[PDB]
Assembly symmetry: C3
Homo-oligomer: 364 residues x 3
């Protein structure tokens, strides 16, 4: 049985994260999204896995993977969903959307035994987004109607094609979903351990994962669940609160407080800062005194521009989404929902009250 993972989108809705990485390598704890997919396919025995990507997303993927077939897309644009065609298979195949996270693999294992065409569906609370599966009287696919303002049922297209899905399901469309899955993963996929190094006068409570070569210095105080990734350097006198995820080689410093945030590879928050309910991408540097607001005065849900459309995040508390290789000056101030583009620089003292462009030098 062949299998295909459909990347090749350009996750615009997941900017600024996707300015610098394909959505396939969105980190969930230590591992990129696509690795979970490959991993769970192999638990069904699949072995021959191909990823449909776009040049010049073309690898990248090659650098990152890893004994797997990388094949590009061509060449009009639409689908659905692609194209599709760039995949070469005779007989059957397993097609899986490359922006899915799913917990168990059991329904994929089950679906590949069948010789009829079959697809997986999943129940959700918000079927008015996603494509709803309408079934006939013998529970086969009548049609997939999409955006149906008037949703016939709660059963939607789970995006695995060759059955109702059981476990945890999430597509990573908008940036705050990066928080969603990472919270879930920290709750479900990993367990209290310490392969790193912790000094005296460090308080630790609840589920705390400390990976190898991670240093945690005196005065630090950790309230779980927390994930501290390999090579990270915490403290002295840091404070990590529940659902802090530091994916790899992160610097958290004196008088710095993190909460319910995903902070990606190599990013550093060295002094006098509070990061709440945020996603900070790779190789970011916060200047001393950089602060993120995560609550609006009226306590209404924080809104975010996603493809130029102003949209509720469904979160009462949401911070910022910082792109890769951003540097903030000292005493920077960032407002709720704000997106800051990859490679931006925020001039000292700035109050960031609007989205900031790729490469922008935002100085007042």
């Amino acid at each position: 049985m062949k299998a295909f993972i459909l990347a090749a989108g350009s996750g615009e809705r997941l900017e600024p994260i996707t300015h610098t990485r394909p959505k396939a390598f969105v980190p969930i704890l230590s591992k990129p999204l696509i690795e979970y997919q490959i991993e769970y396919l192999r638990k069904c025995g699949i072995r021959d896995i191909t990823v449909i990507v776009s040049s010049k997303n073309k690898e990248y993927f090659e650098k990152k993977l890893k004994e797997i077939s990388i094949v590009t897309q061509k060449d009009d644009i639409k689908g659905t969903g692609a194209a599709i065609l760039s995949a070469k298979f005779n007989d059957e195949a397993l097609i899986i959307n490359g922006d899915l996270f799913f917990s168990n693999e059991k329904e994929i294992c089950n679906i590949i035994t069948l010789k009829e065409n079959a697809i997986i569906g999943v129940k959700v609370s918000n079927p008015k987004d996603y494509g709803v599966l309408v079934l006939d009287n013998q529970n086969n696919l009548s049609k997939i109607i999409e955006k149906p303002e008037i949703p016939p049922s709660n059963l939607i297209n789970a995006g695995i094609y060759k059955i109702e899905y059981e476990g945890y399901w999430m597509d990573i469309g908008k940036p705050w979903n990066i928080i969603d899955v990472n919270k879930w993963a920290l709750d479900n996929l990993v367990f209290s351990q310490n392969l790193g190094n912790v000094e005296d006068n460090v308080k630790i409570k609840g589920k705390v994962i400390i990976e190898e070569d991670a240093e945690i210095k005196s005065g630090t105080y950790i309230e779980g669940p927390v994930y501290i990734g390999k090579g990270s350097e915490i403290g002295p006198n840091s404070y990590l609160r529940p659902y802090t995820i530091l994916v790899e080689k992160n610097k958290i410093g004196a008088s710095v407080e993190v909460k319910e945030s995903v902070i990606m590879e190599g990013s550093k928050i060295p002094h006098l800062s509070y990061v709440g309910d945020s996603v900070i991408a790779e190789d970011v540097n916060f200047g001393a005194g950089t602060l993120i607001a995560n609550l609006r005065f009226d306590e209404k849900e924080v809104k975010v521009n996603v493809k130029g459309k102003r949209i509720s995040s469904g979160r009462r508390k949401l911070g910022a989404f910082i792109g890769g290789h951003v540097r903030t000056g000292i005493n920077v101030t960032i407002l709720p929902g704000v997106k800051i583009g990859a490679y931006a620089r925020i001039y000292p003292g700035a109050v960031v009250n609007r989205d900031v462009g790729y490469g922008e030098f935002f100085k007042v």
Copy 2:
């Protein structure tokens, strides 16, 4: 013996605190000002206590007070005089101003034995405010001069009276004052021209809570005199504690916190990790103090939260306030002169070299807010992130630059 507490001012001079509570419920440690009064009256045996309030806030008082008589004032005319006109007594009564804090009750106990009209006087360093008692050659009340500028003595009206039904006569005689009010003090002045009106000098600690920095004053004094080192709450390891520290029940204090007394930590409060409470920090109830937050000589009222990266010095923060991360208060002027505060539109020295801010109830500050010395921020205000607050801020104001 009946007793009346006069509590139907709108304490304008105590704004912003009084935007959201009657001055009678200004917290001194865990207890409201009026409760100390009722408490100390009962130590004299008084039992029948009535509070003259203004409808509305009639009702408030009803919610808060339990088996004490709540009676409103007549809505036409204002004044302490107008207040007892709504008071029904009898023969004698004990009248006490509802903005007073006094330590011992001994002179009230003493004064209520006499059957002459008598009032209590008290020596202060600034008699040019308050009403000065001028006495005759036999130490009875000649007259009460209001804010004399040329003060005959230091002995001023302590605002505890024992008075007979005759005052109601003199209350009709006298008419409205310069500020549009029916001053009881005028009535007493006629009464002393005369009944013989006896003037008992007060011994202990005395303070009226007129201006907002007096909230700090009494609370320091209470922490120094009325309570003693204890811990009914929970303290983690690596918490340093020095001096007088009171930790009330259900109060959590987390590792890294460092406390230099005297400090009062009220019930339900959550301190740390890595907080720093310095001398005369008063957290009245259910306060959140967080990582890299430092408090000093400040009264922080019910339910207010300072969760990150802030310094609060020499300030009064009222109830259900929220400081955004990085909110700072300045408490010293560049020239080190005494910090000035606008009180009823008048710019006035606080007598303090170090004074921070007075924040009203339900204020929220954004992150990286910066507040200057002496500033008043009105109840329900919102300060925009990054704002520099260099002027008083209105009730409800969205101050955004």
Copy 3:
């Protein structure tokens, strides 16, 4: 053998430090620069030491030094040449530039035995600044070329001379230089045309303190070489200490403090609670470092205080300074190019990728002040709360936006 220390420059290049002290009293750890000089002279036995200063600051030097000879410079004519014209010596003398720090004294000891004119030279990486010594075929002084651009060798003038009375002759011969000064180097250049003038190469550590970041340079070196882990002070529990840490007497260090050496904590200082001193923190004397304050690679001079919520990196803060809560120093530029500093009105690279600020004596910053890399702030300045300091700030300036 007489000796003269030349200390009558303006040290303009070392502003703002020199607004309030002569360069001779730039602190290197606990001791002023000149004391190291005197100290190391005496290790050669010299005993009769004179310092050529500028009246006033005559001044000063008298208050700080006895009984070392203090002698002013004369006639509204400047220069090292003008300096020794005020120096009175028959026969020989040792002349040493009063802005030098040198580790060993061995070459001075050696040079004073000779009876020829001799000077010390020293190899450096940047000989295009400084005066290069060109030697003849028998290693005596051919000439000193000033800032050659095409540097013949790496061997430059170390600014220690042994000279005979003959120099006074050559001092009258030569006349004013391009920059309006009487250069002693010109006199020595004539003298070498010739007396035979011997050039001894210097061995150890050598540094002139011309620009403000050199204060950091020597202080790092001193902390690495001249002092060793000890604790004559007091340290509370939950204080972490790593690496070389010097704690002088009457210094208090409170719980939560975390120290990563090498660090020097001068006498009388008060650290913590929850402070964080990182490598090459030098607190020279009586310094206050407070909660949620972090210092790094910085020299912080007598009596200065950083009490709350601040980060000082790669900076020099002079005496009796006060940083308001939330005062931050930026030490890195966005492009990571070397930080530039105005030095005598010329914009100049510091050679440092990471450089913070140079704060003059008696400066006060308001809360939430924000200071940019390379910035100089003049003595006695005041920075208004919330200000972003993005330019040099004047002596006495009230910088408010």
